[PDB]
């Protein structure tokens, strides 16, 4: 998964 | 004597079944689809035993220690069909018989029930 907001 | 092993914790999502061993407790989660291990007294030393693609429902630990031996009072019973253990002190066994059968007054022999249904 991504780690951005 | 009610105690909490794991509580107020996010390690549990939708746990289904558990089994024990020496100072360890194993359980399966249907939410995260993984089998877990923890200390059975305070829930520490946790780790993931297994990841499963499908939901893991059942779990058992196979070992003789999980299956302690004892005397079999039912082994001396004269009950026909079913002989079920019981907690009553004098005998610790009780005769029973399947669906559609009649318990005779002998308390050990059963006869098929011919009544309609």
């Amino acid at each position: 998964x991504x780690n951005x907001x | 004597n009610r105690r909490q092993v794991i509580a107020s914790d996010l390690v549990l999502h939708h746990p289904h079944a558990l089994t024990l061993f020496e100072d360890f407790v194993y359980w399966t989660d249907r939410g995260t689809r993984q089998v877990m291990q923890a200390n059975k007294w305070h829930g520490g030393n946790q780790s993931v035993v297994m990841y499963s693609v499908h939901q893991p429902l059942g779990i058992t630990a196979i070992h003789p220690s999980r299956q302690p031996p004892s005397r079999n009072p039912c082994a001396s019973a004269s009950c026909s069909h079913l002989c079920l253990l019981s907690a009553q002190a004098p005998r610790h066994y009780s005769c029973a018989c399947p669906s559609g059968w009649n318990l005779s007054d002998d308390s050990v022999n059963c006869v098929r029930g011919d009544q309609p249904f």
């Binding site: 780690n3 907001x5 | 996010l10 390690v11 946790q46």
Partner: protein
């Protein structure tokens, strides 16, 4: 004086002393933790996965509850609003801009100073003045005025101008001079 950090991949929140010695896990399995704050006895963090705000005891993570329901749109960032003044102390930068040109920050020992964002700057005069790095320096006997004009340190703050802009006689250096 403890430092708390939350890892969104290992999925746990940890604490340690300000020197980073005593690592401990205050709460394991904290999900996809975004920014975290500490107030009172509890620590509060926002989770990107379950879209909730959680709390737990700051020492052992025992009383873990969710502060809100499932928020509609994935909260991010959290802080605490407090009315009481917090640990006030006297900074050295108020007095004559900490003895520096324009920008200073209170460091562990005295005022600590830095140059602006834009420009090929470099530090001079015990790193208290900001000048343009023209590829030139002056030796241990010349004081450096601003813009690079550098003259012998005896005239430095002699209550007489010695440069093209009066940089030497600025009060920033003459506030405490020998």
């Amino acid at each position: 004086d403890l430092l708390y950090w939350a890892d969104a991949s290992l999925q746990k929140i940890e604490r340690s002393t300000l020197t980073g010695t005593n690592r401990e896990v205050v709460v394991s399995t904290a999900f996809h933790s975004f920014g975290l704050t500490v107030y009172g006895q509890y620590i509060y963090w926002t989770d990107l996965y379950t879209r909730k705000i959680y709390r737990a005891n700051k020492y052992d993570g025992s009383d873990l509850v969710a502060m809100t329901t499932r928020l509609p749109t994935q909260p991010s960032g959290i802080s605490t609003v407090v009315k009481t003044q917090r640990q006030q102390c006297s900074n050295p930068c108020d007095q004559f801009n900490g003895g520096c040109s324009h920008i200073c920050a209170p460091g562990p020992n005295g005022a600590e100073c830095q140059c602006p964002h834009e420009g090929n700057w470099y530090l001079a005069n015990d790193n208290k003045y900001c000048v343009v790095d023209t590829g030139t320096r002056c030796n241990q006997l010349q004081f450096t005025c601003l813009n690079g004009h550098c003259i012998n340190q005896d005239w430095k703050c002699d209550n007489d101008n010695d440069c093209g802009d009066g940089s030497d006689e600025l009060p920033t250096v003459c506030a405490f001079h020998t």
